[PDB]
Amino acid sequence: ALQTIINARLPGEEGLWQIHLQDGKISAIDAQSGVMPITENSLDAEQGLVIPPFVEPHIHLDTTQTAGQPNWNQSGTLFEGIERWAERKALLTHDDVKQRAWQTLKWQIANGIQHVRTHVDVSDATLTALKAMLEVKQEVAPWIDLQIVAFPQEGILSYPNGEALLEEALRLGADVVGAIPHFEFTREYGVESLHKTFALAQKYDRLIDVHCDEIDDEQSRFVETVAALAHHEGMGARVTASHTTAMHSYNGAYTSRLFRLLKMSGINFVANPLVNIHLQGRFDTYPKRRGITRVKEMLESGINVCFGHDAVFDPWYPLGTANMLQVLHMGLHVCQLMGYGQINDGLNLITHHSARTLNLQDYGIAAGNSANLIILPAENGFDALRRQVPVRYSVRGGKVIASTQPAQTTVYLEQPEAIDYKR
Amino acid sequence: ALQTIINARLPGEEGLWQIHLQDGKISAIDAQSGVMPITENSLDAEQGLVIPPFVEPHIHLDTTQTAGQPNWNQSGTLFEGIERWAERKALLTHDDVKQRAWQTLKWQIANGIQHVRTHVDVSDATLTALKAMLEVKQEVAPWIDLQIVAFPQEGILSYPNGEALLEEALRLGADVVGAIPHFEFTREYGVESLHKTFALAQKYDRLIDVHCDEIDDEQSRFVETVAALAHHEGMGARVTASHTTAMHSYNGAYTSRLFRLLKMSGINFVANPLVNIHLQGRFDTYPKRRGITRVKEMLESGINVCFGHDAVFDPWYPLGTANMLQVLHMGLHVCQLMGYGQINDGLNLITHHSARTLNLQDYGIAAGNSANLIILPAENGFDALRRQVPVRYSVRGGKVIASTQPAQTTVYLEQPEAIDYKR
Ligand SMILES: O=C1NC=C(F)[C@H](O)N1
Ligand SMILES: O=C1NC=C(F)[C@H](O)N1
Ligand SMILES: [Fe+3]
Ligand SMILES: [Fe+3]
């Protein structure tokens, strides 16, 4: 029955703070002028950093843990990945999807992630994975608020009954409408697919998250239609453009023109560093492009951008432990957001910016909000990122739902010495 | 008084193995047909992976821990980095260099690194850092065999008395002769500097490690002179070309021609993933090149290539905990060595290949060799890399010199559950 979080550091704030908890919510936040004593019912942050929970804005829980089944993606490309997934999709069973999704979700809970948006392939007349995921959503609710995107992986207009299946998925309860314009057979189908996606989102009052321009094609500009339709409907807050890796290859003049619309539209952007560095640049010899969208410029322009893990051991990515600080680490390097302040503020890319992408209404350390927060054994964002620290405690509804007793490293010199990699 | 390492897995080998130790050496290695019981004097690898120690083939211990002093490298480029370092170099003191070097060395010991090659800037008439590092080398010897490269950071022919200072550093005991041809004022000075470097290495019987073509200039081809001079002198095993990031920008025809010489010469290559992804591509707008040398092609051609951390919190890199598995993780992503086998064999890039780069004569788990080895709590290279595991035990001369009690993570669901991120 926790009543207070004491000795907490907060990003962008000086000193220590006390967070009072009442009835599963944050009742008040007060600055401390020194270190407070521990006591029963008090969770001691020990001058560590307290932040709202990590968020996973983009993952594929229906494909997670399937890498190599029945075959491996040899080329390491998005296109072969979809082909390898199609082979696995034909072998799906309800229980298998639930088991694999739950395996990755447990890693996420352990990693302080309390909000997850999973795409689920609905280019499947049986909607096997979707039915399984809707059950997982209910089962995992005490620990993670899971959003499900009805993702038409093989296209809306380019797959048999694609539009009907996408709508069926919404009627079954999917929270977000997906699309993949660059995978449609033609540019015209791509644009038309977006009009259909927006019409469905307005008909059912759902969010939108488009796999948008995930291709090293300087002519893949579906993002301008996503932003324009959102602006026209006055619904930018409910819309997300995932990937936009083609933007890495656009000329600068078009990008500058486009940025005005991106800002005016208010839509969100998701970059997936671990997967993008792996799948993009595969058609270059040397030099080889990085292939991540224009994260640095978006931040400078005040456009909301955040980071997702995208895949965890599946056709598009052979690694991962569903760790957001690891995703952030890769993104900061590839996007060259390596200034001290840029690294320190990096936490926003896996917390607040992602919460905005998911249109969350109860997020942040503020009075009145649910007591959902995590404690990192680090002094600030820079320190947490540099040392790739685990989540010491994850609190949800005012209760501890995960904890990590840190590793203990000792070197035996003339005398034993504890090493914590700090300075 | 350890007598045996039991239940050890070895890369590329099936089953479990027992490593018998006698008089600080490995006396014999025998396969097990099952799990052996623990007993006093036996170190149980617990079916974890046993490998020779991690190696750091390229780091700057004279600059480590100085990021932001007195100013930060704002552009994130090699060139500004050297300028910021020059400002810090003027403030060096003997004790400060020793303290900072020892701080990073302790992190390395904790991370199972028993072999380290540090470059030390000798473009300094006072040779302050070199004198300090020669003392550190002696002090750290019980735990790490430290090689010192006399690195003429500001050039040999382009800095006052550069050649005399480089030779003075060798007379004081530096183990390796360095150079930086692409930083010399002219291409001719660059080539001439290499002839002088090789002449010094033959005069003093020292190794060579050139900061070679660390620039996104398709015309920076000093590597062909390094390889040709090594081939002419029949000394490839003693020569290393660090960085060669310009190779990322070469046309393919010249690279193919060059590769024949690289193979024939037998020289070694070091890629520094964390720093290269950060400092390279800084003059591109979009698309932006990755800038790491041709690691994948070198491996396919049987050319020895390995990975270094290069910098730990200094003018050229604001992060790091001197962790080789983290360096490897970045390299596998940026170089797209993402096939299962490529990832699994990744350990060679931070163990055996690096030992060859340092021309080590006592390295590897083989009878007769010193009992220097480390134990990773993982099933194989892939698993160790994916989970970024710590070093459970580091053994040197048959004695434990470092150990890490792993972190313990628990999620509180309907029942508490331990999470180890394994599958
Ligand atoms: O279309 C896609 N499917 C799965 C992925 F992991 C990638 O995000 N893109
Ligand atoms: O010339 C250089 N000095 C320092 C570095 F870290 C980089 O390796 N290159
Ligand atoms: Fe995706
Ligand atoms: Fe270097």
Side-chain angles (χ1 to χ4, degrees):
Chain A
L2 292 181
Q3 293 178 51
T4 321
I5 303 75
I6 62 172
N7 302 319
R9 286 186 178 176
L10 300 171
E13 296 297 324
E14 297 291 352
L16 300 179
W17 303 74
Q18 189 168 183
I19 301 71
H20 302 289
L21 311 180
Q22 178 63 298
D23 305 311
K25 301 184 181 304
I26 295 172
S27 55
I29 296 73
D30 305 302
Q32 302 176 188
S33 60
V35 176
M36 285 287 172
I38 186 274
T39 187
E40 209 183 314
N41 300 312
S42 274
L43 187 58
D44 196 355
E46 297 182 351
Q47 297 183 251
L49 195 70
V50 176
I51 54 286
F54 283 137
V55 178
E56 170 51 272
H58 188 130
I59 193 279
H60 295 258
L61 294 178
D62 59 335
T63 67
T64 194
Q65 312 292 172
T66 68
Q69 316 179 329
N71 302 299
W72 287 90
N73 174 350
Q74 303 310 314
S75 65
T77 65
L78 167 71
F79 310 109
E80 187 179 334
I82 284 57
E83 184 49 86
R84 292 291 83 77
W85 167 240
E87 303 175 324
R88 185 61 170 74
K89 177 163 55 173
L91 311 166
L92 293 179
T93 74
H94 186 83
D95 288 350
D96 177 59
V97 170
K98 296 184 72 180
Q99 199 282 155
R100 289 184 292 97
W102 256 114
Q103 175 170 36
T104 293
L105 285 159
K106 289 181 184 182
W107 294 2
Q108 292 178 306
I109 296 171
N111 295 337
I113 295 77
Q114 291 185 32
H115 297 282
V116 176
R117 171 176 285 177
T118 183
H119 293 260
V120 176
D121 184 354
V122 294
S123 293
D124 176 355
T126 71
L127 297 173
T128 296
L130 178 66
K131 291 181 292 183
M133 207 62 65
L134 285 162
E135 291 183 3
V136 173
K137 173 177 175 177
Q138 288 174 160
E139 295 169 2
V140 78
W143 304 281
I144 286 177
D145 189 339
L146 183 68
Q147 288 186 187
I148 292 65
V149 186
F151 173 48
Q153 175 76 91
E154 299 188 42
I156 293 293
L157 298 182
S158 307
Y159 185 81
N161 300 316
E163 195 180 354
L165 287 171
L166 178 59
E167 183 162 8
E168 183 177 0
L170 299 180
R171 289 188 291 95
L172 289 165
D175 307 289
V176 190
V177 196
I180 187 174
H182 55 285
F183 195 72
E184 299 285 357
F185 293 161
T186 68
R187 190 187 191 280
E188 290 66 40
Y189 280 5
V191 172
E192 185 182 359
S193 79
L194 294 175
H195 284 277
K196 290 174 179 294
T197 295
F198 274 78
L200 283 168
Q202 292 296 64
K203 179 175 178 181
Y204 291 91
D205 190 11
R206 303 292 159 84
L207 305 178
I208 291 295
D209 191 319
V210 178
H211 267 69
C212 199
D213 306 308
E214 188 188 2
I215 182 59
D216 294 322
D217 176 13
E218 80 287 346
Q219 295 168 53
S220 195
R221 295 176 173 187
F222 296 108
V223 63
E224 70 179 19
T225 292
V226 176
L229 288 175
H231 186 268
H232 181 262
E233 300 276 347
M235 63 185 286
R238 293 163 56 209
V239 180
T240 296
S242 282
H243 291 297
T244 64
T245 57
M247 200 185 296
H248 193 267
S249 298
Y250 292 168
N251 62 69
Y254 170 72
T255 304
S256 186
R257 194 285 281 165
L258 178 65
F259 262 51
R260 173 174 180 266
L261 164 63
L262 303 188
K263 181 57 181 173
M264 290 172 71
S265 76
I267 72 171
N268 304 286
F269 293 83
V270 176
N272 297 116
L274 298 173
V275 171
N276 296 156
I277 191 178
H278 159 54
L279 305 184
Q280 304 308 117
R282 290 283 182 169
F283 301 90
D284 285 334
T285 49
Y286 280 102
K288 207 178 308 284
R289 74 198 67 214
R290 295 166 187 231
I292 291 59
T293 193
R294 301 190 185 215
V295 179
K296 178 179 288 181
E297 292 71 21
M298 287 172 180
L299 290 172
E300 289 168 356
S301 296
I303 289 165
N304 191 56
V305 59
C306 65
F307 292 161
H309 193 125
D310 199 3
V312 174
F313 196 71
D314 81 3
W316 303 277
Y317 193 67
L319 296 169
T321 54
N323 188 300
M324 302 321 289
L325 281 175
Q326 188 178 85
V327 174
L328 175 61
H329 176 275
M330 183 63 64
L332 296 171
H333 283 77
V334 179
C335 300
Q336 294 176 329
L337 283 160
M338 298 289 285
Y340 179 84
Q342 295 175 324
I343 294 165
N344 192 58
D345 294 344
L347 292 185
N348 290 327
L349 297 162
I350 53 58
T351 55
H352 294 284
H353 293 191
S354 301
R356 181 172 177 186
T357 293
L358 268 56
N359 201 218
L360 302 185
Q361 307 297 305
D362 184 359
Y363 184 92
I365 305 185
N369 285 3
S370 297
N372 302 340
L373 54 89
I374 66 175
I375 300 177
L376 307 183
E379 304 188 4
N380 46 50
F382 175 90
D383 187 42
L385 186 285
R386 185 177 70 80
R387 292 188 298 110
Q388 291 288 285
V389 303
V391 172
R392 185 68 183 81
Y393 297 103
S394 176
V395 172
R396 186 173 172 74
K399 296 181 176 58
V400 173
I401 53 73
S403 66
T404 289
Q405 172 179 290
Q408 295 174 181
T409 302
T410 304
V411 293
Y412 302 92
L413 309 183
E414 289 192 353
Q415 81 301 163
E417 182 174 347
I419 296 72
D420 61 3
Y421 307 97
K422 296 178 186 179
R423 187 177 94 295
Chain B
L2 292 181
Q3 293 178 51
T4 321
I5 303 75
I6 62 172
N7 302 319
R9 286 186 178 176
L10 300 171
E13 296 297 324
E14 298 291 352
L16 300 179
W17 303 74
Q18 189 168 183
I19 301 71
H20 302 289
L21 311 180
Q22 178 63 298
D23 305 311
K25 301 184 181 304
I26 295 172
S27 55
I29 296 73
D30 305 302
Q32 302 176 188
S33 60
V35 176
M36 285 287 172
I38 186 274
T39 187
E40 209 183 314
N41 300 312
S42 274
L43 187 58
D44 196 355
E46 297 182 351
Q47 297 183 251
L49 195 70
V50 176
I51 54 286
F54 283 137
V55 178
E56 170 51 272
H58 188 130
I59 193 279
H60 295 258
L61 294 178
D62 59 335
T63 67
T64 194
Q65 312 292 172
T66 68
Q69 316 179 329
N71 302 299
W72 287 90
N73 174 350
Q74 303 310 314
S75 65
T77 65
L78 167 71
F79 310 109
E80 187 179 334
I82 284 57
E83 184 49 86
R84 292 291 83 77
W85 167 240
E87 303 175 324
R88 185 61 170 74
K89 177 163 55 173
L91 311 166
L92 293 179
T93 73
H94 186 83
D95 288 350
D96 177 59
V97 170
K98 296 184 72 180
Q99 199 282 155
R100 289 184 292 97
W102 256 114
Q103 175 170 36
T104 293
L105 285 159
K106 289 181 184 182
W107 294 2
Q108 292 178 306
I109 296 171
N111 295 337
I113 295 77
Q114 291 185 32
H115 297 282
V116 176
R117 171 176 285 177
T118 183
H119 293 260
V120 176
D121 184 354
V122 294
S123 293
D124 176 355
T126 71
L127 297 173
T128 296
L130 178 66
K131 291 181 292 183
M133 207 62 65
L134 285 162
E135 291 183 3
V136 173
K137 173 177 175 177
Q138 288 174 160
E139 295 169 2
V140 78
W143 304 281
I144 286 177
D145 189 339
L146 183 68
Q147 288 186 187
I148 292 65
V149 186
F151 173 48
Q153 175 76 91
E154 299 188 42
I156 293 293
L157 298 182
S158 307
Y159 185 81
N161 300 316
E163 195 180 354
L165 287 171
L166 178 59
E167 183 162 8
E168 183 177 0
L170 299 180
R171 289 188 291 95
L172 289 165
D175 307 289
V176 190
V177 196
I180 187 174
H182 55 285
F183 194 72
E184 299 285 357
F185 293 161
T186 68
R187 190 187 191 280
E188 290 66 40
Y189 280 5
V191 172
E192 185 182 359
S193 79
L194 294 175
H195 284 277
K196 290 174 179 294
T197 295
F198 274 78
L200 283 168
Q202 292 296 64
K203 179 175 178 181
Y204 291 91
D205 190 11
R206 303 292 159 84
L207 305 178
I208 291 295
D209 191 319
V210 178
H211 267 69
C212 199
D213 306 308
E214 188 188 2
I215 182 59
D216 294 322
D217 176 13
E218 80 287 346
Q219 295 168 53
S220 195
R221 295 176 173 187
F222 296 108
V223 63
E224 70 179 19
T225 292
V226 176
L229 288 175
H231 186 268
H232 181 262
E233 300 276 347
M235 63 185 286
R238 293 163 56 209
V239 180
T240 296
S242 282
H243 291 297
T244 64
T245 57
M247 200 185 296
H248 193 267
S249 298
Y250 292 168
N251 62 69
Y254 170 72
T255 304
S256 186
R257 194 285 281 165
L258 178 65
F259 262 51
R260 173 174 180 266
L261 164 63
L262 303 188
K263 181 57 181 173
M264 290 172 71
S265 76
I267 72 171
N268 304 286
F269 293 83
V270 176
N272 297 116
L274 298 173
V275 171
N276 296 156
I277 191 178
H278 159 54
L279 305 184
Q280 304 308 117
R282 290 283 182 169
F283 301 90
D284 285 334
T285 49
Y286 280 102
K288 207 178 308 284
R289 74 198 67 214
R290 295 166 187 231
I292 291 59
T293 193
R294 301 190 185 215
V295 179
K296 178 179 288 181
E297 292 71 21
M298 287 172 180
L299 290 172
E300 289 168 356
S301 295
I303 289 165
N304 191 56
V305 59
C306 65
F307 292 161
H309 193 126
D310 199 3
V312 174
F313 196 71
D314 81 3
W316 303 277
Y317 193 67
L319 296 169
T321 54
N323 188 300
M324 302 321 289
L325 281 175
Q326 188 178 85
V327 174
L328 175 61
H329 176 275
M330 183 63 64
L332 296 171
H333 283 77
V334 179
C335 300
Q336 294 176 329
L337 283 160
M338 298 289 285
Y340 179 84
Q342 295 175 324
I343 294 165
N344 192 58
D345 294 344
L347 292 185
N348 290 327
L349 297 162
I350 53 58
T351 55
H352 294 284
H353 293 191
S354 301
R356 181 172 177 186
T357 293
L358 268 56
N359 201 218
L360 302 185
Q361 307 297 305
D362 184 359
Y363 184 92
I365 305 185
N369 285 3
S370 297
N372 302 340
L373 54 89
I374 66 175
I375 300 177
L376 307 183
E379 304 188 4
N380 46 50
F382 175 90
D383 187 42
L385 186 285
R386 185 177 70 80
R387 292 188 298 110
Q388 291 288 285
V389 303
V391 172
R392 185 68 183 81
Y393 297 103
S394 176
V395 172
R396 186 173 172 74
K399 296 181 176 58
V400 173
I401 53 73
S403 66
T404 289
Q405 172 179 290
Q408 295 174 181
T409 302
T410 304
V411 293
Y412 302 92
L413 309 183
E414 289 192 353
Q415 81 301 163
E417 182 174 347
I419 296 72
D420 61 3
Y421 307 97
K422 296 178 186 179
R423 187 177 94 295

